[PDB]
Design a protein around this ligand. Structure first.
Ligand SMILES: CCCCCCCCCCCCCCCCCC(=O)OC[C@H](COP(=O)([O-])OCC(O)COP(=O)([O-])OC[C@@H](COC(=O)CCCCCCCCCCCCCCCCC)OC(=O)CCCCCCCCCCCCCCCCC)OC(=O)CCCCCCCCCCCCCCCCC
Ligand SMILES: CCCCCCCCCCCCCCCCCC(=O)OC[C@H](COP(=O)([O-])OCC(O)COP(=O)([O-])OC[C@@H](COC(=O)CCCCCCCCCCCCCCCCC)OC(=O)CCCCCCCCCCCCCCCCC)OC(=O)CCCCCCCCCCCCCCCCC
Ligand SMILES: CCCCCCCCCCCCCCCCCC(=O)OC[C@H](COP(=O)([O-])OCC(O)COP(=O)([O-])OC[C@@H](COC(=O)CCCCCCCCCCCCCCCCC)OC(=O)CCCCCCCCCCCCCCCCC)OC(=O)CCCCCCCCCCCCCCCCC
Ligand SMILES: CCCCCCCCCCCCCCCCCC(=O)OC[C@H](COP(=O)([O-])OCC(O)COP(=O)([O-])OC[C@@H](COC(=O)CCCCCCCCCCCCCCCCC)OC(=O)CCCCCCCCCCCCCCCCC)OC(=O)CCCCCCCCCCCCCCCCC
Ligand SMILES: CCCCCCCC/C=C/CCCCCCCC(=O)OC[C@H](COP(=O)(O)OCCN)OC(=O)CCCCCCC/C=C/CCCCCCCC
Ligand SMILES: CCCCCCCC/C=C/CCCCCCCC(=O)OC[C@H](COP(=O)(O)OCCN)OC(=O)CCCCCCC/C=C/CCCCCCCC
Ligand SMILES: CCCCCCCC/C=C\CCCCCCCC(=O)OC[C@H](COP(=O)(O)OCCN)OC(=O)CCCCCCC/C=C\CCCCCCCC
Ligand SMILES: CCCCCCCC/C=C\CCCCCCCC(=O)OC[C@H](COP(=O)(O)OCCN)OC(=O)CCCCCCC/C=C\CCCCCCCC
Ligand SMILES: [Zn+2]
Lengths: 124, 100, 152, 141, 70, 51, 186, 98, 226, 122, 93
């Protein structure tokens, strides 16, 4: 982390980089009123939050939690036999909902259920 | 003049999200082997057979479904007392003659 | 029929009866149709800004008649809405734990009728009138009143 | 732009972090003294040295940010700026045109077809014997 | 000036005379040696605004003169 | 506090007694039956109207 | 109590001696009626634009913000020394003055209600005009509907004038006024 | 580059000496800008037209004295004497000596 | 400054209706006895009287010219005060960043009172520490207990008053020769003749010296309706 | 070049128009400028919601030191006696409110038969 | 008078030939009795009398009409009911 404003900061190209962050950090800021002061405050924030080793552990945890969350939502909509977004089957009585009954057995036998059920002998 | 979001953010994330939803759904159907042919009808086989008989002329037109079952509820017994399919057909025939 | 003008000019003149086209093609005419207080700020406008404003304003005002037509047809449709079958009272239909009184906590008018159930209220008002209590509404035939949207 | 941002769309006060590009660097320049050469040891600190109006560039920035508020004429922006200023307005207007001249016509055609054939022209005719128009969005069935 | 431009038909002879006098004055002051701050010699009666000629009371010309029915 | 409690108390007590006697239309109905008994007429004109 | 309440005036001499300022009007200095002046020039009466006369009474407000500035002393009418110092003001204004001041303190709320009520009256007119009319026949017999589904369900789209007349005759039969009305022919 | 190019404060001129934009409701008077440009000439066109400040010639000797005492100021004073100083030139002079 | 809102119309010029009507006494009042409005119109009347007399400008010294326009010739005393004033104002809505303070050059902490709360963040980089807040009272050379950064309080105080632009102008500016009303009249006739007024301020000012309502059209100018 | 009154002559055609056309154009121009716009001017000037917020507030003095009431007095009382009167009037309603609120408690207490706690078992 | 920014394009002051007497406020000066407002003509304060008068009248009409309707018309569910809510003429209840 450089301590002199003359020494530039390296930035990659893309949508999450040092240059991308600089453009947007001071959009709502009343304190970055001139180039010298703006750069000083920008580097102060970058030094404090992005050069902090332990902060990266939380980045991993949010990604993992969010990835699981998005996927469980998507899986319900796409595969759960009881979640309806289309209406064709909901305009018919229960005995006639064949297309929705097709999701039932495949959804009843997920891989992890087959892999972990044999390990009940470690609890009983 | 400084930009915060994608230059075309509204259309990008709207149409883009719709596209991902549609494509993901097709993939999900393929993996579970779900039948993708839309049927707009009920699947009660005996009923669909009675409807074919009406289309074939075996059962007179405008004959109610409760005039064909082997068990009637109370409200359908009330209706059967005032049901006259023959009169209904004659009335429709009269209307057609007047129209033409 | 005037022959001192072309056919195109005649059509444009008549579409300019209110001066809309003249104000579009003349900056001076547009600024002198502003009230003096706002004309003071006119000199700063660009021609891009001026004509774009007129375009947005003209598109809006020219679509108001269309929305008005669509709304009139809606009123006529609702004014002669077809009767629908009386609902059979199914397993989970018309469940009531207490009477309908939230509109009239103290008076408790039409406790058995629902808030916007007009036919139930009419018969209920008739009972109150037969009991010497005046209630308003549900007495004039629709075709004998103005703004009913039910006349042939 | 509609929303106010202190850094970019600062229309409440009109503050700008840097001077106009039209001005020569000898007249006015952005406040940036990061490249100042090392101070000789025999030089002595007279001022505070604190970042503030003692620096010429910062002083001129404050001065200009107040004296720019009165100008003889408008600084005409280019058409790109003008388009961006009313992007939503123009887009909504075109959306209204689409709703009248695109959505309107085919919606009318569907209802007229429905009148004669009981179901819209983009639906599968039923044989179950049920009555009524049925669904309208066929791809959500 | 724009206000004068509206009356250029009548002011043209004075404007041409004014142009000459201003040019004479500019030349005289520029050519003078440093430290010489004497006033230039010119006819100020044709230059506006000056003490010698403070201008004319121009009438507003924002008056319609045509009959819309013609 | 008590001074302004009295007028509210009096108003509510009369209102509460009235509400227990019946609905507004049940009250007007009792006066209608009495007027029908006084005149011996099965059907009388509604209040504010002539025969 | 005080002379000001006894003889209400706007911007007179001897305001301090009179004891109170009874007018909320601030500003002035216009050279003509409805002309450019100083101050905001707001009051319950005699301000703004007169609708009946089609004339301006006071000019547009001159705000004490960036768009404007201060008012010259020649035209100041609410002196803060007299406007404030409310010591024993109730005795100077009396009970009727207290009622007047309370009513005059709610000009902002009054201005709003004058702009808000009209649209709500219009909405209420929609309700009243509809409530007078007899209810339309929302529902009919379930069975009879399905025995004549096409006529009832589609009659409106095919011929709306005859469908309207048919509906009217059914309303006249449902409410027992058929012999008292003459339904216009279609 | 602020407020869309609209100056927060600007001068407006009126040909009629007794005109009031708040009292009158006439529809013929056309306001002018600080340079005198009528409002019906759009900004995009008027801003291209070159406007220069003309001081009375009696001021030329004073403007000459200023240039000589401060040689860095001479080029700006010369422009003013020769009627070549625009508003932008004046602004450059103003901020150069602050 | 960034913390200030938008210039008012008054920030540029004042309406001529705010000109004091007793111009004769206004031009004779000492500067220390003139209020804000009186001082504005004293400078404008006198400054424009000299600027609208072209034939005399070249022979007028910068010292005299600055006096007529009401501009204060700068000197080290006044520059110091004005500078510390503007530094105080800037710090109202701006960050406080500068060189590390030492005994030779302490961190300068401007204040009006006798105390101002200050925080030390240490040096640059790894020498930066957590904010250590302390109350900086006058008359003590403060030393941070952590980084040994020296601080000092500077008070904007002068003769039972704090430092303001008005105070600096009153203390250091000296009134020159009394303004002569003959100059006002002479310049007035120069630019105002035959219904043309090219010095509006001098037409109003001369009218007041004449007693208000004397010059043509001035009674009509002073007649208002509300 | 001849200049016609604003809004009276069309520029779309060399022909000014026929009698009916001219009547429509002239009279719409008059109706808009001198009849319809009476309502707008009346609403804009005489019924401004923002002018009404500054009603009764002292003038802003040009002398900066004569406006100290801005910070010496709270904004809720910038109106002098008018603003003090509004507060005082609402103050007079305190005890009437207490009696009204106390009545509601009595109403609920009675309707729930809580007064017959002892009479119930006597 | 208005903003310092609005101004006449040509700076002219009329040489009024009319002989009308000067309004008193036109020649006035600040005085100890009138620290402020000496340039504005004194006017009547109608609001002080008209606002409390008009408010009282409207309240009296509002309350009096309400009392009258609810005491001089037959009992009914609403005001519109008490006016237009009776049975048809000739319908005996
Ligand atoms: C389901 C129902 C959804 C309902 C949506 C309702 C939308 C209402 C507003 C619509 C509107 O007028 O938008 C146009 C308008 C366009 O703005 P513009 O400045 O003209 O845009 C210029 C260009 O588009 C280019 O603009 P730009 O990209 O340069 O950036 C400028 C603009 C860019 O933004 C926009 O323009 C917004 C557009 C939104 C459209 C939505 C559809 O910035 C803003 O306007 C920012 C507004 C403030 C946003 C604050 C967000 C707060 C919540 C943050 C999350 C907190 C929880 C985190 C939890 C997880 C932690 C790990 O949007 C606004 O000004 C509204 C901003 C505020 C909206 C708040 C909505 C709730 C949050
Ligand atoms: C000389 C004349 C002086 C008149 C001075 C003003 C009198 C205002 C009082 C008045 O007329 O009251 C009766 C008047 C008419 O009611 P009514 O049906 O004749 O009598 C109530 C029935 O006892 C019971 O009928 P209801 O059970 O159908 O209730 C109707 C509703 C009466 O009020 C309304 O219906 C509200 C009117 C505005 C409706 C706006 C709807 C906006 C859209 C919402 C969503 C759809 C709604 C669909 C319905 O009741 C309460 O709100 O409404 C009020 O009670 C208050 C109106 C003013 C607020
Ligand atoms: C034998 C003896 C016989 C004796 C016989 C004697 C007979 C005497 C007959 C006398 C007849 C007098 C007739 C007078 C006629 C006056 C007409 C008039 O003024 O016209 C109104 C007005 C005339 O304007 P103007 O000439 O500028 O004003 C003249 C003044 O009003 C003139 O008034 P002023 O200068 O005297 O006083 C000014 C002020 C003085 O005002 C006052 O004194 C009022 C004082 C009220 C005090 C408020 C207190 C508030 C605070 C209360 C406390 C709350 C808190 C309490 C809680 C507890 C506290 C502890 O008055 C007003 O401003 C009144 C309002 C006028 C405008 C109204 C606008 C419409 C409002 C609609 C919404 C409201 C509707 C309600 C309906 C109610 C049922 C009827 O004309 C209009 O409103 C124009 C309307 C245009 C409509 C155009 C629509 C366009 C649509 C386009 C579609 C596309
Ligand atoms: C030459 C030309 C001549 C021309 C002549 C004609 C001119 C025109 C005449 C027009 C006449 C119109 C008459 C009708 C007016 C409308 C009445 C109305 O709508 O009400 C009934 C109407 C329908 O109900 P209703 O069936 O007729 O009423 C039954 C009765 O209330 C039956 O009474 P109740 O037993 O149910 O009452 C229980 C009591 C509740 O009783 C209590 O709580 C009090 C009991 C104790 C009494 C003794 C006092 C003890 C101390 C009390 C302390 C209280 C304060 C404590 C603190 C706060 C607690 C909350 O509640 C009330 O009294 C309600 C009103 C309360 C006062 C409201 C303010 C006055 O109600 C509404 O729809 C509500 C009002 C809606 C319209 C007004 C909206 C106002 C908006 C603001 C602007 C208004 C501008 C108006 C301009 C007008 C210019 C003319
Ligand atoms: C703008 C142009 C016009 C666009 C018009 C669009 C009109 C219709 C819009 C409807 C709402 C949007 C979804 C459209 C889905 C279309 C395809 C479809 O029918 O999908 C059906 C399918 C399931 O259907 P069934 O067969 O009935 O169920 C079987 C058993 N489960 O449902 C879906 O996939 C759609 C519903 C879910 C939509 C969102 C995607 C799911 C995951 C959401 C994650 C949320 C957490 C955060 C995510 C962040 C980003 C990773
Ligand atoms: C040599 C090349 C020649 C090419 C010629 C191309 C000709 C193309 C002609 C296209 C005609 C399209 C006509 C569409 C008519 C629609 C009418 C209609 O539906 O009106 C009612 C409907 C609303 O009905 P509701 O009752 O409210 O019901 C729906 C909502 N509940 O109204 C609307 O949709 C309003 C909009 C009407 C749009 C009409 C479009 C006409 C387009 C003409 C194009 C001509 C192009 C010519 C090209 C020539 C090239 C040489
Ligand atoms: C503030 C919101 C005010 C809403 C006022 C209107 C409320 C309303 O219309 O409610 C009725 C509406 C439709 O119900 P039904 O009358 O049974 O529908 C039968 C259709 N013939 O919904 C309700 O009854 C729910 C009302 C909830 C409370 C609304 C007021 C708060
Ligand atoms: C069934 C119908 C019943 C009708 C009943 C009507 C009862 C009306 C009784 C009116 C009594 C007189 C009230 C006004 C004068 C009261 C004088 C008095 O001593 O009151 C003191 C008492 C409390 O003392 P403080 O608030 O500390 O007094 C100093 C100012 N704050 O003041 C009040 O209650 C004032 C009340 C004024 C508003 C009353 C509104 C009533 C509305 C009904
Ligand atoms: Zn430290």
């Amino acid at each position: 982390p450089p301590t002199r404003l003359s020494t530039p900061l390296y930035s990659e190209g893309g949508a999450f980089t040092v240059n991308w962050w600089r453009n947007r950090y001071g959009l709502y800021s009343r304190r970055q009123t001139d180039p010298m002061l703006a750069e000083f405050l920008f580097r102060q924030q970058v030094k404090e939050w992005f050069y902090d080793v332990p902060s990266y552990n939380y980045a991993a945890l949010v990604g993992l939690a969010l990835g699981i969350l998005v996927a469980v939502i998507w899986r319900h909509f796409l595969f759960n036999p009881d979640v309806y977004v289309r209406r064709q089957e909901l305009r018919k009585m229960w005995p006639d909902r064949h297309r929705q009954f097709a999701y039932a057995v495949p959804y009843l036998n997920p891989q992890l259920k087959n892999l972990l059920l044999p390990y009940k002998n470690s609890f009983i | 003049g400084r930009r915060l979001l994608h230059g075309n953010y509204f259309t990008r994330y709207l149409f883009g999200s719709l596209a991902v939803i549609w494509i993901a759904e097709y993939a999900a159907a393929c993996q579970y082997g779900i039948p993708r042919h839309r049927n707009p009808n009920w699947m009660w086989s005996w009923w669909l057979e009675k409807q074919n008989q009406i289309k074939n002329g075996e059962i007179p037109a405008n004959t109610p479904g409760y005039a064909m079952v082997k068990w009637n509820n109370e409200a359908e017994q009330r209706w059967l007392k005032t049901l006259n399919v023959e009169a209904m057909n004659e009335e429709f025939a009269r209307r057609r003659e007047a129209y033409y | 029929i005037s022959t001192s003008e072309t056919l195109n000019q005649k059509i444009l003149r008549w579409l300019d009866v209110t001066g809309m086209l003249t104000r579009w093609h003349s900056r001076r005419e547009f600024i002198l149709d502003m009230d003096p207080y706002f004309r003071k700020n006119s000199g700063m406008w660009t021609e891009w800004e001026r004509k774009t404003l007129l375009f947005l304003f003209y598109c809006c005002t020219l679509a108001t008649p269309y929305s008005a037509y669509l709304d009139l047809q809606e009123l006529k449709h609702q004014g002669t809405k077809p009767p629908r079958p009386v609902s059979l009272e199914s397993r989970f239909m018309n469940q009531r734990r207490y009477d309908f009184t939230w509109m009239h906590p103290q008076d408790k008018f039409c406790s058995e009728c629902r808030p916007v159930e007009l036919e139930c209220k009419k018969m209920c008002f008739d009972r109150y009138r037969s009991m010497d209590y005046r209630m308003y509404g549900f007495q004039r035939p629709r075709i004998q009143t103005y703004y009913s949207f039910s006349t042939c | 732009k509609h929303f106010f941002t202190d850094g970019a769309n600062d229309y409440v006060t009109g503050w700008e972090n840097t001077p106009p590009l039209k001005f020569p660097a000898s007249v006015m320049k952005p406040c940036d003294y990061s490249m100042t050469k090392p101070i000789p040891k025999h030089w002595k600190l007279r001022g505070s040295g604190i970042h503030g109006p003692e620096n010429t560039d910062l002083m001129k920035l404050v001065l200009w940010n107040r004296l720019k508020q009165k100008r003889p004429q408008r600084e005409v922006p280019n058409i790109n700026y003008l388009k961006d200023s009313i992007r939503l307005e123009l887009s909504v207007n075109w959306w209204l045109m689409s709703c009248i001249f695109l959505w309107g016509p085919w919606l009318h055609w569907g209802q007229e077809y429905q009148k004669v054939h009981e179901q819209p022209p983009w639906a599968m005719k039923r044989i179950d014997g049920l009555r009524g128009e049925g669904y309208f969005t066929w791809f959500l069935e | 000036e724009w206000r004068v431009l509206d009356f250029i038909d009548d002011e043209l002879p004075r404007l041409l005379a004014e142009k000459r006098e201003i040019e004479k004055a500019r030349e005289q002051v520029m050519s003078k040696a440093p430290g010489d701050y004497t006033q230039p010699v010119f006819d100020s009666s044709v230059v506006v605004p000056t003490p010698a000629n403070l201008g004319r009371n121009y009438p507003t010309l924002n008056l319609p003169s045509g009959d819309p029915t013609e | 506090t008590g001074f302004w409690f009295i007028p509210n108390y009096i108003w509510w007590e009369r209102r509460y007694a009235y509400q227990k006697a019946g609905f507004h239309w049940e009250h007007t109905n009792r006066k209608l039956q009495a007027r029908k008994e006084a005149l011996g007429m099965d059907k009388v004109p509604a209040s504010g109207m002539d025969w | 109590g005080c002379e000001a309440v006894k003889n209400p005036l706007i911007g007179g001499p001897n305001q301090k001696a009179r004891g109170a300022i009874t007018s909320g009007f601030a500003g002035g200095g216009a050279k003509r009626l409805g002309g450019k002046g100083y101050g905001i020039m707001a009051d319950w009466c005699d301000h703004g634009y007169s609708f009946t006369k089609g004339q301006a009474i006071t000019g547009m407000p001159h705000w004490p913000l960036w768009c404007g500035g201060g008012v010259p002393d020649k035209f100041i009418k609410i002196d803060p020394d007299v406007h404030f110092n409310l010591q024993g003001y109730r005795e100077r204004i009396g009970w009727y003055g207290f009622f007047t001041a309370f009513l005059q303190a709610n000009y902002h709320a009054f201005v709003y209600f004058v702009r808000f009520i009209p649209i709500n009256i219009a909405i209420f007119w929609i309700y009243v005009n509809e409530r007078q009319r007899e209810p339309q026949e929302n529902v009919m017999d379930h069975e009879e509907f399905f025995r004549d589904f096409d006529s009832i369900y589609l009659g409106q789209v095919f011929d709306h004038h005859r469908f309207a007349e048919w509906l009217a005759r059914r309303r006249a039969v449902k409410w027992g006024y058929a012999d008292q009305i003459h339904i216009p022919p279609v | 580059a602020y407020n869309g190019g609209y100056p927060f404060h600007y001068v407006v001129q009126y040909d009629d000496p007794n005109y009031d934009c708040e009292a009158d409701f006439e529809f013929e008077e056309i306001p002018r800008d600080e340079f005198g440009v009528p409002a019906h000439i759009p900004p995009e066109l008027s801003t291209q037209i070159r406007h220069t400040y003309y001081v009375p010639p009696q001021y030329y000797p004073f403007l000459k004295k200023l240039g000589e005492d401060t040689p860095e100021l001479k080029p700006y004073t010369d422009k003013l004497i020769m009627g070549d100083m625009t508003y932008d030139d004046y602004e450059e002079m103003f901020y150069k000596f602050a | 400054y960034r913390h200030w809102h938008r210039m008012s119309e008054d920030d540029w010029a004042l309406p001529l209706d705010s000109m004091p009507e007793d111009v004769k006494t206004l031009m004779a009042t000492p500067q220390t006895e003139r209020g804000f409005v009186e001082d504005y119109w004293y400078n404008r009347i006198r400054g424009e009287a000299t600027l609208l007399d072209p034939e005399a400008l070249p022979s007028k010294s910068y010292i005299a010219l600055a006096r007529d326009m009401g501009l204060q010739i700068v000197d080290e005393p006044s520059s110091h005060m004005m500078g510390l004033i503007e530094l105080y104002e800037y710090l109202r809505g701006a960050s406080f960043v500068g060189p590390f303070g030492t005994i030779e050059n302490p961190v300068l902490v401007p204040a009006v009172g006798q105390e101002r709360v200050v925080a030390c963040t240490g040096g640059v980089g790894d020498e930066e520490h957590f904010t250590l807040w302390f109350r900086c009272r006058e008359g003590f050379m403060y030393r941070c207990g952590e980084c040994d950064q020296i601080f000092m309080l500077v008070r904007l105080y002068y003769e039972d008053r704090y430092w303001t632009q008005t105070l600096v102008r009153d203390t250091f500016m000296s009134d020159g020769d009394m303004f002569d009303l003959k100059t006002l009249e002479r310049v007035h006739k120069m630019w105002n003749k035959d219904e043309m007024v090219r010095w509006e301020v001098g037409y109003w000012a001369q009218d007041y010296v004449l007693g208000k309502g004397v010059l043509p059209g001035m009674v009509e100018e002073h007649t208002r309706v509300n | 070049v001849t200049r016609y009154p604003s809004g009276t002559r069309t520029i779309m055609s060399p022909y000014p128009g026929g009698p009916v056309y001219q009547w429509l154009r002239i009279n719409y121009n008059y109706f808009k400028r001198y009849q319809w716009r009476r309502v707008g001017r009346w609403q804009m000037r005489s019924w401004c919601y923002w002018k009404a917020a500054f009603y009764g507030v002292p003038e802003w003095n040009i002398d900066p030191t004569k406006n100290q009431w801005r910070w010496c007095v709270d904004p809720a009382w910038y109106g002098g006696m008018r603003d003090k009167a509004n507060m005082d009037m609402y103050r007079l309603m305190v005890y009437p409110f207490f009696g009204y609120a106390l009545l509601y408690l009595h109403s609920r207490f009675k309707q729930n038969d809580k007064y017959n706690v002892f009479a119930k078992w006597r | 008078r208005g903003s310092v920014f609005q101004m006449p394009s040509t700076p002219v002051y009329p040489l009024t030939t009319t002989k009308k007497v000067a309004p008193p406020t036109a020649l006035a000066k600040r005085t100890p009795e009138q620290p402020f407002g000496w340039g504005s003509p004194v006017r009547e304060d109608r609001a002080w009398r008209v606002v409390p008068r008009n408010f009282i009248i409207l309240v009296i009409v509002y309350l009096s009409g309400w009392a009258a309707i609810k005491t001089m018309l037959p009992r009914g569910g609403s005001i519109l009911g008490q006016i237009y809510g009776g049975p048809p003429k000739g319908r005996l209840i």
